[PDB]
């Protein structure tokens, strides 16, 4: 794929001269939902990436989008030269361009923020206060892209998705055109992760947003009211709200004395098959599917059991009907784990955790919970936790590699992630690459695999899913990838002993994230690197 | 189970032909219906079960009475009766206590749909005085041999079929929504072979596993939910595997998106078997069987399929197949018993069936609740859950089936309360490592003559379906 | 004054039988600003208390209030029997009653939340999951006030100002009618401090609020961008940003409870040349009133010759922020603990606040200037501020009816006054008593006596840096000729002499149960073991 | 400072009566006069014109406002010479303020022409006039021709020591908005202020005076004696012979917003010391609604007091107060005892932005007094901008006359600029000389060697009480750029 280029490099290479690089110039605030059209010229990877960007907006703001219906104003997405947009609505159909390199989540989010009404962060009048502009290092004629002019009463943000990178319109790669007056920020400006917390604040103050479209419930256990959860009465005992005073919480990891709370069910005493029930408050879903994400730990007997249940409506408006959803079992890990459970609730319901004592005569520990989130989105297909990443990074040379355990999609395709901690082609970067694995389904499946989107995402472990800045990369499997890479691994795959399976050649972004960035933004919380991977058919957008 | 003529005689009624109230005349579907508050919750659940049978075997449909010129209201005021024919005005149907059995309910509804009795030799000298007019002239709709009878030693009508209470006969259905597909058979590496009687369960489809490479394979709605039923056999390696897949629409009108639904793994029972798979398809789709070779050298047989059906109904919560039932019925004295495996419902209650092949001249089934790993999250005593026990008619076409069924609702009135948490009221059995409740059921569930009568004992297998569902929402 | 009564007791004493104790049941959301009328029957203390409640709404939400002027829907405040309101926007007229005894901040805030559209927390459909109703302990014929009657995806709030106290409609004072299922919350339910965080979240979701009318700036320094502040270029050095991990350093935001987190600004005075300085400066701020209060925490361990100067830079009338004006000077002294400062600004045009540090004699200084927890609000600064050191040790070492007295403060007119604190209240076991008194001073000959129609507002500062999440306890009264033992005549006549001020103090008047000890220990009121009290004393004759 | 006739002669101009432009029924202005300050007009000249307009508003009903497109507007520009068109032309008309015309009395002259006036010139030493110019003599006043105007030989006047003054308007020039209150006293508390008639030796008025005695009664006994702009200056003369513990407090009572004036705000406190002479006080008021000023006298120690508090000559103007004030006692003795180049230095004064400054006085400059401004290092220096530029120095010798119509205060103005070198206005610790009296560096003095003549001081009331009172102002005018 190659290193992701900045929008200013793309539009310069495309021979454009729009105002401020990506802004085109031919009462101006939208009324939600914004009508959209994905045009036929727009490539399949770009269509998929645009719909992934819309899910981020719904998870983090009140912004929403719909297919066209004969409405007054609308956004048409097309594959023209360069990445560009027209700032604010303009009352008859406006056009966003995404083409020949623009198909990245953060670049599409950027072009949509222009259409919502935002200008560049560095375009504000008070740039001369926060950043230096090296005018002698800007390319000839392109100085006009650094001119200024709108009072939402908010501070200047170096993390803003709407900021230029240190090397924008730059005549020699050795010397940046922009530098921060606070030196720590020189490696922050022009990030391509996600919306900053100040970007979401400004979007919400401009559009009177007070709630998001796809977040139902969120609980870190840090308030004594336990987020309005309730304890069972028909069960033998109760969950204790503990305060981190030989264990640490996942919200703060014991870095704070007193602060830091988690729920515990002690398995070291009492009768076998005694249980404790923790239940949510009544929730009202707005989609057919939800993902319950939580962090848990087990140290007791292997026979101890954390079961996830739903109690849903009886169709008469009484929340009485139980259903058993997933079971987690005790083992030898003894560290905090991430769990995902797919719910499918179409009517009002509650989520319940049932801890149960398996062998209390041979247990000296228990079950722990922290950091719950419920979203109205699909759950990540594969999740890979690399323990002790800092030590992995210090013990590996350039071009040493780790491989995930084998994973499987809904159709039954097998796949995995290869991690190189010290990237061969990019010194000081981590390289992630995607490979297909042979499996028990290879005869019912189609080959070569095509039109499936791969989404790889490094999780920012921030407890509030709104403020997470997770790094993501996306691609679509195509016959144009040759060495065809995606043919049945049996014919061309390099055999591996650890799965008794054939792995395809791996085609992945050489620079996924810098080592410097990995250190910050809670990505390596607990020194665990957490990678999400999705592999899904997008042929229906064609 | 008492007869309708007995129930109405015991109620002290004197209706036309024993169960008709005499106060064009054909319905327009769906029939608008209202369930009265007086009507029992157990009766309401049984009435819904009867409605499902009507939709499955006939065009007849039932809808809530939001507004219509004519409709049916079900009452428990006095005995069991139904005015014959649509009255052009809202009519009335009575479901007497002791007549909640599904058969009795289907009978009353057949009168509302317009039927008179099938009999309408008669021994007039054996009839009760003052009831001879119920035998005047002018199947589920026939009198029993001892209807209005004065002396149990002699019948009023002459035999063993008449006044059956299984289901609609094929003639009752001929004289009168939820079936999608049915078949008796009469990109992948290899094909399934269509083969002839290695005897058919009804022709059958065979995928051979005795040759070639490992992991070679062969491939063969109006509501929200469906049940796929099929018969299968495996004789190859225990490594061999039958997989059930759905291919569904991607919403562009293209059935392409695969989803894996169930896997069946080879095992040492080499007989034919019955499987149920729940499909949850809300758009157009296909069901696919993937056969796959697990270890060809070790394998000396194949995978076989026969008697497929797909219905828009919930799959049975547990299924038990008692093998060599003729030999079981011979090998058991009165009060010898068999117990099913430990099944579970959606709420996680554990349960089973106890069978006593010699009850006199009847088989006896009884339901019991087993302790399970969910006993702490569950509610006790269990109430307002309906139990359905059914003996399957193995007839492959679901329209033609006359499956025996019985029903009851768990209630604090059942004492010896039988339904409290089994660890406190029940007794420990080593064979499940579990506590079993007292067993409650019917001493007369089916006659030994009946099991022989309608191919229930095909392959000498007896197949029992059991369901245990919360019906509190009807209250 | 006595103990503050609950709204249920006040209406029950008035013999009323309203819906849910305080609702009158004669598109239903308001359009801001809400038109209001303060009726002629409404007493002077109630008028002053209602205007004080409107300033809380403008600090914590987008709610705002304006004069009648002939609009179709308006709130009329009147002095009928009981404390009660209608619910929502009638669109014709709405009466809210601030009866006798209703004139306390949190009661007026409650009635205004009813008019904004809120019902009680203990009447929700899910309630029976979260609290127990002891039906045998309710008074005969009042059980309808605990019946169940709006879904915003918000959880059940025990802290809600809209929740009933444990003894509401109770037949026996020893047994509660309500108890929380989570047992810690039994002393939280029915609090009368302020809006909870969840109360404000629900108010803001229901009205599409994203900002507040009277907050201009806030900064705790916990983000490395220093909340949009900038360093000076014309000065001699820079302010550092320090992490509280070093021995002998501690941030005011988290007080080292967290480790590897907690930040403050430092200017070192332990080296360099005399009269070197450093500037730290705000973003460009746009005021919407004539007056502002800058509140910040500071500490000075350096030479008593070191100086912290607050400056403003304001617009020159060309639209360029260039004109400097000097505002306040703070000097080094021997109290090395954290201190609270308040500086009044009077800016009518866009401006920037600046802190200048200055090194005086670094030859003999081993310390420096420290800053944390800045806030700027469009409200008048507190007239007097009293910090009681080691309060937990004071509370343990004092007996019942021992006392402490504040320094002597002055109001704008020049009246001298102070606060008397009794840590272990005589009349209210487990409470702290605060009481006001007037002190003789150098202005007693120009001032009017007996002092009447002035309003006293006493507040205990919650110390939470983000002003939207403070739950400060506040109490109010108006000086009146009825107060006799007249208490408010010139202190040299009616007072007693005190050797500590060489002055005369009036008889002290206030609330014996000002706050419970359990409440002070729960929230940030005793942060660092400093208790911070604010007091105000202003003329409200113009509301008459 | 040169005369206007010399400035227009140096420009080589030949205008009607030397400074009137004639462009060709009855014409006369209707106030306020609309005006424009042109972009070509230098920064010192813009500031000097605005100081001249405050004199018009302080002394007359004349007023000035910005352009609104009416038929008549006056545009001020930097052409050659100082000149004007007499009276309203009924169209836009121009005033020229050339190089050297920035002095207030020259601007006041050109404006008097714009209002409509002619010189008092009337039927002169013809043999002393420059060849050809004789027509400019055809037929205290500011407009009166200077004695040496249109003169061929500096040894002899053409036209005695009063004529052609450049102080201010005479009373007669005013005879041909910003004063609120004025009193010379000549026409809840414990006791009263005594109106007193100067009948006791050693107790004489500054002009009758108001007296609060401190030699009897109890301590802390008191007596009380009780707008079109946002800001006002209360000027008064006071004296305090009593205890150093005695106080004079200035208080304001303002409208409470019901229309009743009851609220009291403490404004300034003045404290007794061992200077028993009359002092001049300035108190800034900031009143936007109706109000009363109050003086509270208070007895500090009646057991160690043999005197009192005295007040005289109150005035209240809707203008900023003077930034710094200096009172040179016994000037007549100073002027006799000093030689050429002996000096006195003012106490350090601070503007609103915090720049430290002062004045140097040389009493014998020949026969003139020399005043010069300097910047002093102070506690703010690190935070201030340097070199200081675009701040306007005004130095004024107050004519002590209590009625503000009758004052003729000598005033000079300049604007700090990088062009001033010997840059004089850089930070005094870099470019100045250190002094032990202030413990501070002082920048090089810049000012006028001929600020006023010793003759002019005697004629006016500047030397009342043998006090010379100097006012100084140092304010940012960058916004006029
Ligand atoms: Ca936690
Ligand atoms: Ca067959
Ligand atoms: Ca801090
Ligand atoms: Ca600096
Ligand atoms: Ca008096
Ligand atoms: Ca006088």
Residue numbers in the entry:
A (entry chain H): 37 to 62, 72 to 194, 200 to 295, 298 to 535, 542 to 600
B (entry chain D): 40 to 62, 72 to 168, 177 to 194, 210 to 229, 236 to 253, 263 to 272, 284 to 294, 299 to 303, ...
C (entry chain E): 37 to 62, 72 to 194, 200 to 535, 542 to 600
D (entry chain A): 40 to 63, 71 to 169, 178 to 193, 209 to 228, 236 to 252, 263 to 273, 284 to 303, 313 to 331, ...
What's in the article?
In normal tissue homeostasis meprin α performs key roles in inflammation, immunity, and extracellular matrix remodelling. In contrast to meprin β, meprin α is secreted into the extracellular space, whereupon it oligomerises to form giant assemblies and is the largest extracellular protease identified to date (~6 MDa). Here, using cryo-electron microscopy, we determine the high-resolution structure of the zymogen and mature form of meprin α, as well as the structure of the active form in complex with a prototype small molecule inhibitor and human fetuin-B. Our data reveal that meprin α forms a giant, flexible, left-handed helical assembly of roughly 22 nm in diameter.
Our data show that both the zymogen and active form of the meprin α ectodomain (i.e., the region released through furin cleavage) is capable of self-association to form a flexible, giant helical assembly. The zymogen form of meprin α is plugged by an α-helical pro-peptide that sterically occludes the active site. The pro-peptide forms a small helical cork which plugs the active core and thus sterically occludes the active site. Accordingly, the steric occlusion of the active site represents the major autoinhibitory mechanism. The dimer interface is most extensive (1374 Å2) and highly conserved between both meprin α and meprin β. This interface is defined by the M12A protease and MAM domains, which are dependent on a conserved MAM/MAM disulphide bond to form the covalently linked homodimer. Two identical MAM/MATH interfaces (610 Å2) each provided by two homodimers together drive the head-to-tail formation of the non-covalent helical assembly of multiple homodimers. This latter interface is defined by extensive charge complementarity and salt bridges between the MAM and MATH domains and has a calculated cumulative solvation free energy (ΔiG) of −5.2 kcal mol−1. The MAM and MATH domains buttress the protease domain, forming the outer structure of the helix interacting via a head-to-tail arrangement, while at the dimer interface a conserved disulphide bond stabilises MAM/MAM interactions (see next section). Cleavage of an exposed flexible loop, defined by residues L61-L67 located distal to the active site, releases the pro-peptide and exposes the catalytic core of the active site.
